Design a protein around this ligand. Structure first.
Ligand SMILES: O=C(O)[C@H]1O[C@@H](O[C@H]2[C@H](O)[C@H](O)[C@H](O[C@H]3[C@H](O)[C@H](O)[C@H](O[C@H]4[C@H](O)[C@H](O)[C@H](O)O[C@@H]4C(=O)O)O[C@@H]3C(=O)O)O[C@@H]2C(=O)O)[C@@H](O)[C@@H](O)[C@@H]1O
Ligand SMILES: O=C(O)[C@H]1O[C@@H](O[C@H]2[C@H](O)[C@H](O)[C@H](O[C@H]3[C@H](O)[C@H](O)[C@H](O[C@H]4[C@H](O)[C@H](O)[C@H](O)O[C@@H]4C(=O)O)O[C@@H]3C(=O)O)O[C@@H]2C(=O)O)[C@@H](O)[C@@H](O)[C@@H]1O
Lengths: 380, 380
């Protein structure tokens, strides 16, 4: 049975099972995945330190991005302080290399780690370990275990926890490292450094002012904080903390953030309201992949006021069928294919055959190289 | 009388005239524009050679950018060939430093050239010259006079001219160079080198296969091609060619693009139809700023087919009051402020007081640093 981590363990166990049986269809699917994964074996490992403009700590190992919806104010001689245009990404975000590099690393590590679990081939673990060492634990290239300067905003006087949501890009890679333990390439010394990094990152998460603030957020930030938290705790094998987090934080947050009619009012007020309602559900989906590995179903387990996350799925389902019917401010097109993994996950967790049907009818492209769709041959 | 170039000469002469007579309102406004200008004096001049990944010619002096709506195909093992998602900018465009650096050069050179025209202070001519010399004529840092690899698309086998439209960012700076002739900093040797560059660039525009194809386009590319053409012709003082282009290319192109209702069907079929309808007129507006300096009004001169550009402004005018009423696909919000300079230019050219009154009611911010608004004190 799969090690505890940020994936649909049932679908991974089934793919590894079929690949080992020599089942034709899965075998061909995995051979395609191996072809996609060759670029990650050849890819040079990325580091948070590959930036010219340093953060106020003057430390190139400190992760730093720009908060995406903040823009220079043209009415100020220096553009300072920035102003907020909700839903409009300031392309200045791409001058911070971490932003896209954390996606490239996360994609590389996740794909290689999953392919190692499924095939057993050492070449995937060796490449995966190379990316992990460099991003996380290397004494010069490794990222400091904090998110102090994530989504900083030029001109802002107070510190914010909002940047912590960036962590989900590399925290999935943190969790997949559990899959390459036991390989020849991931030594006991490697595992200890990663362990120690995750322990220091978990501390910063729970005890820094920014972490505490992010833990109490009223919208999808607070849900994403707990999903990221679960990935860190699951890597650290702290399964009783996962139970406490789900019952003392995730379920209360779900209970407050879902209205009686199943809508998410904190997301309804955004300019990307259909996208942020989905982003909230995406946070629960990824949390649930971990909690359900220790018997906690977050789609059907009620909060203390009896609300269940499936109520939020129900409210959105008609608009996953027709995003044009969405009646709230959505200033950019909504990507309907996001409903596939979402409805499949919610649908199986709930025994809702309509959701699963709709997920397969929406579907994923068989030959897509989007790494988060690797477990989902069932949608292809 | 102002030198021939890419700006509202009436407003520019007005500003210089009031500035020299010590008029208080204009002096306070030019004093703000000099505060804004201070960053361009200190700013290090940009070069097209400041890039790591080189074009197929392996020449860093060749301008190269990515066509913004072309994305890697995830269903292909290498992502090749890219596919088009009209109206969705691919953040990969920012990995080509020329794309934003030509904007930064253009603003610096335009702002400093105009301020030197208005104030006569040699410090603006000297800084403006530094930027122009580096971007255009420097034997190591200057861009080659061609747009061969503008808006290239990975995996596409045929060459296209679509990328020429990028030239507007630096072709206005080329035009403003005329304004610093006579200064101490812009020597006869500088002017000759820039004249030879402009001559070579004009030859490339008119004779390269990509130039020819782009001069033939049936949508706003064709209009922007000609508006760029006029800037180069005006910098070279070829006023006979300016008339020929106006009468034999812009006006027939303009008339071929206007429907009976005044709409622009080539732009209505885009996913950003109100943006691109306004982008078409913006090209015509910038062409007109030059043609009218020799007595050709593109807003009111009809074409061979009877269509006149005033008809397309009439069609768009209601939706500049209320962009929400726009009935055609527009998958991002539309910046209503663009109608200020557009309606003032068209309003003044047509003697339409309603357009001019709406222009000022929409207005521009008095304190803004957007350098294209420098001449428009009347709108602030
Ligand atoms: O990095 C990305 O592109 C991903 O971003 C994901 O959306 C995130 C953003 O990245 C930001 O973190 C954004 O921060 C928001 C908060 O969610 C919140 O709305 C906050 O609201 C305040 C505001 O600061 C201000 O004071 C105003 O006057 O009041 C507001 C209020 O009362 O709520 O503003 C923050 C901000 O914009 O700085 O939040 C979103 C999010 O909700 O997750 C997502 O788009 C993802 O797909 C991207 O990849
Ligand atoms: O981001 C920027 O740099 C600025 O872009 C400005 O918009 C430009 C773009 O830069 C592109 O050049 C874009 O090219 C379009 C063509 O205009 C055209 O629609 C063409 O459509 C073809 C298509 O390629 C295909 O072959 C199909 O079968 O037929 C179509 C057809 O006949 O129309 O596709 C090109 C493409 O996308 O590559 O066009 C716009 C433009 O119209 O000017 C602008 O948005 C500006 O504000 C930005 O700063």
């Amino acid at each position: 049975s799969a090690p505890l981590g940020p994936f649909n363990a049932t679908l991974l166990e089934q793919l590894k099972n079929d690949y080992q049986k020599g089942e034709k269809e899965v075998t061909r699917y995995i051979e395609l995945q191996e072809k996609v994964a060759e670029k990650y074996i050849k890819m040079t490992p990325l580091s948070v330190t590959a930036k010219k403009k340093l953060p106020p700590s003057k430390d190139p190992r400190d992760y730093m991005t720009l908060s995406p919806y903040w823009w220079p104010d043209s009415t100020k001689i220096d553009g300072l302080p920035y102003i907020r245009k909700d839903g409009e990404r300031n392309p200045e975000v791409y001058e911070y290399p971490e932003r896209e590099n954390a996606n490239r690393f996360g994609d590389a590590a996740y794909c290689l780690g999953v392919l190692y679990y499924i095939t057993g081939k050492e070449v995937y673990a060796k490449a995966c370990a190379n990316h992990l060492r460099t991003w996380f634990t290397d004494p010069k290239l490794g990222m400091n275990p904090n998110m102090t300067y994530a989504q900083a905003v030029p001109g802002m006087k107070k510190m914010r926890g909002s940047g912590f949501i960036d962590s989900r890009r590399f925290s999935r890679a943190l969790g997949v490292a559990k899959l390459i333990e036991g390989s020849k390439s991931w030594t006991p010394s490697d595992k200890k450094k990663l362990d120690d990094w995750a322990t220091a990152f978990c501390y910063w998460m729970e005890n820094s002012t920014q972490g505490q603030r992010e833990s109490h957020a009223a919208n999808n930030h607070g849900l994403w904080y707990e999903a990221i938290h679960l990935m860190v705790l699951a890597y650290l094998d702290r399964t009783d903390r996962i139970r406490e987090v789900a019952e003392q934080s995730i379920l209360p947050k779900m209970g407050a953030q879902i209205a009686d009619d199943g809508s998410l009012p904190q997301e309804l007020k955004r300019t990307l309201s259909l996208h942020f309602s989905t982003f909230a559900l995406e946070a629960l989906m990824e949390a649930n992949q971990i909690t359900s590995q220790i018997g906690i179903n977050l789609w059907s387990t009620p909060a203390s006021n009896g609300k269940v996350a499936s109520q939020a799925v129900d409210y959105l389902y008609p608009f996953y069928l027709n995003p044009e019917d969405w009646k709230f401010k959505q200033i950019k097109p909504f990507d309907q294919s996001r409903a596939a993994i979402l409805l499949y996950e919610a649908g199986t967790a709930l025994g809702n055959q309509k959701y699963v049907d709709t997920a397969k009818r929406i579907g994923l492209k068989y030959s897509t190289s989007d790494v988060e769709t690797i477990p989902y041959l069932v949608l292809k």
